[PDB]
From a paper:
[name]-1 belongs to the B1 subclass of MBLs that requires a dinuclear metal center for full catalytic activity. Zn1 is ligated to three histidine residues, H120, H122, and H189, while Zn2 is coordinated with D124, C208, and H250. To address whether carbapenems undergo pyrroline tautomerization during hydrolysis and whether diverse protonation mechanisms exist for different β-lactams, we conduct a combined investigation on [name]-1-catalyzed hydrolysis of imipenem and meropenem using X-ray crystallography and NMR spectrometry. Our data presented here revealed informative details of the reaction including (i) double-bond tautomerization in the pyrroline ring following the cleavage of the lactam amide bond; (ii) three derivatives presumably representing [name], EI2, and EP; (iii) absence of the bridging water molecule attributed to steric hindrance from the newly formed carboxylate that is forced to take a distinctive orientation resulting from the trans configuration of the β-lactam ring in carbapenems; and (iv) exclusive stereoselective protonation of the carbanionic intermediates.
Six imipenem-bound and five meropenem-bound structures were determined by molecular replacement and refined at resolutions from 1.80 to 2.32 Å. We first modeled hydrolyzed imipenem or meropenem in the Δ2 isoform in all crystals and found that the ligands could be well fitted in density in some structures with good planarity remaining among C1, C2, C3 and the sulfur atom bonded to the R2 side chain during refinement. We finally modeled Δ2 ([name]) in one imipenem- and three meropenem-bound structures and Δ1 (EI2 or EP) in five imipenem- and two meropenem-bound structures. In four imipenem- and all five meropenem-bound structures determined in this study, the carbapenem intermediates present in either Δ2 ([name]) or Δ1 (EI2) bind the dinuclear metal center in a consensus manner with hydrolyzed penicillins or cephalosporins revealed in [name]-1 strucutures. The newly formed C6-carboxylate contacts Zn1, while the lactam nitrogen (N4) and C3-carboxylate interact with Zn2. The sulfur-bonded pyrrolidine ring in meropenem was also well defined in density, but the hydrophilic formimidamide group in imipenem was rather mobile, as indicated by higher B-factors or even the absence of visible density. The crystallographic entrapment of both Δ2 and Δ1 isomers sufficiently demonstrates that hydrolysis proceeds via an open-ring derivative with a negative charge delocalized over a conjugated π-system covering C2 and N4, which is dynamically stabilized at the active site of [name]-1. A tentative equilibrium between the two intermediates, [name] and EI2, is thus established before protonation occurs. Owing to the lack of the bridging water that may serve as an ideal proton donor, protonation at the lactam nitrogen (N4) seems to be impossible.
Author numbering: 43 to 270
């Protein structure tokens, strides 16, 4: 683990890093939020911002120092603060940002800054390639409504890594966390759909825990079963 400012960076694979930022919430303590950094050829790709614009700027600063390649694009997995909180930092730096069309539509109501481009998805959940230009190893999948109506997920092609965001919780988790915006009826099916979308992924990266095995997906699904 590497510390850079208030952020921590961990290499998960030769070309993949996890970024972690913290937000102190009064009465509840500091909460960690994870994202991904992917090196693809002569460019870098980001998945999710940090909690804030300042923290996100630090991600770009670490990238400059540790990777020294231009950041080509970023993808945010839904319209909540821990995933979209630092959109300004990305846009200030001239980085093209992509999100679920629904996330961009919800963003203003959520107090978030919308991404600059919209992803749309097929009936089977896979992104329509036309809306996801030059994503390299990033394979984006909409598993259906769960944590939120708009949550999307990301696999890293050519690695054992898949990113479930706030949809997937780790196998040690006691609850499904914040269900304030959740679709409790479809949550279980969506978690399982993600598992089926990336059947070979063995390392599951998520928003609020260290990377886990596929057990995180199944354990989440089974916790969600009880919500019905
Ligand atoms: C604060 C907001 O961004 C919230 C969300 O996205 O729903 C953050 C905080 C949280 S709570 C973190 C884990 N909580 C466990 N009780 C989650 C989450 O559950 O995914 N995401
Ligand atoms: Zn959320
Ligand atoms: Zn979260």
């Amino acid at each position: 683990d590497q510390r850079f400012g208030d952020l921590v960076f961990r290499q998960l694979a030769p070309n993949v890093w996890q970024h972690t930022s913290y937000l102190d919430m009064p009465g509840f303590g500091a909460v960690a939020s994870n994202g991904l950094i992917v090196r693809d050829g002569g460019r870098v790709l980001v998945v999710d911002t940090a909690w804030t614009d300042d923290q996100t700027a630090q991600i770009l600063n670490w990238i400059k120092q540790e990777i020294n390649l231009p950041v080509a694009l970023a993808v945010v997995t839904h319209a909540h603060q821990d995933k979209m909180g630092g959109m300004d930092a990305l846009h200030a730096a001239g980085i093209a940002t992509y999100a679920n069309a629904l996330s961009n539509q919800l963003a203003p109501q959520e107090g978030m800054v919308a991404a600059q481009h919209s992803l749309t998805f097929a009936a089977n959940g896979w992104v329509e390639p036309a809306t996801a230009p030059n994503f390299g190893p990033l394979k984006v999948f909409y598993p259906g409504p769960g944590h939120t109506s708009d949550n999307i997920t990301v696999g890293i092609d050519g690695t054992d890594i898949a990113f479930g965001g706030c949809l997937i919780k780790d196998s040690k988790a006691k609850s499904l966390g914040n269900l304030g915006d959740a679709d409790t009826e479809h949550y279980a099916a969506s978690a399982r759909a993600f598992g089926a979308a990336f059947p070979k992924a063995s390392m599951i990266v998520m928003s609020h825990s260290a990377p886990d095995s596929r057990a995180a997906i199944t354990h989440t699904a089974r916790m969600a079963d009880k919500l019905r």
